[PDB]
Design an enzyme around this catalytic site. Structure first.
Site, short mmCIF file in Angstrom:
data_model
loop_
_atom_site.label_atom_id
_atom_site.label_comp_id
_atom_site.label_asym_id
_atom_site.label_seq_id
_atom_site.Cartn_x
_atom_site.Cartn_y
_atom_site.Cartn_z
N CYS A 30 0.84 -1.19 0.00
CA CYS A 30 0.00 0.00 0.00
C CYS A 30 0.88 1.25 0.00
CB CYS A 30 -0.92 -0.02 1.21
SG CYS A 30 -2.13 1.30 1.19
N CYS A 33 0.22 3.89 2.73
CA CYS A 33 0.73 3.53 4.06
C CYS A 33 2.10 4.13 4.32
CB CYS A 33 0.74 2.02 4.29
SG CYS A 33 -0.89 1.29 4.41
#
Length: 105
Positions: A30, A33
């Protein structure tokens, strides 16, 4: 500062905590993130001894993600005394996340 929690340690570290608990859900794949990671680390240090901040890799603990309907990452959940108080999804401002940590303090 931000330790991983899983199905095995969830009851003792999250649900049985005497202080509010922030749980950051993330995944190695991700991109966003990477954007929120330093915010989580900063708040963990600022509120050390006041809240516990943990992380859950949703690929490692897909049962925890299913249990709390973590349908995207990043996500942050705030618990107090065994009860879920707030779910925050996406990249939200650090001041917003801090505001929710202050509400449980």
């Amino acid at each position: 500062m931000v330790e991983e929690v899983d199905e095995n340690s969830w009851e003792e570290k999250v649900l049985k905590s005497d202080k509010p608990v922030v749980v950051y859900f993330w995944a190695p794949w991700c991109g966003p993130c990477e954007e929120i990671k330093p915010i989580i680390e900063k708040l963990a240090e600022k509120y050390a001894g006041k809240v516990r901040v943990y992380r859950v890799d949703v690929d490692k603990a897909p049962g925890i993600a299913e249990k709390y309907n973590i349908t995207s990452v990043p996500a942050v959940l705030i618990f107090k005394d065994g009860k879920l108080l707030k779910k925050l999804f996406g990249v939200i401002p650090e001041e917003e996340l801090e505001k929710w940590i202050k509400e449980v303090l």
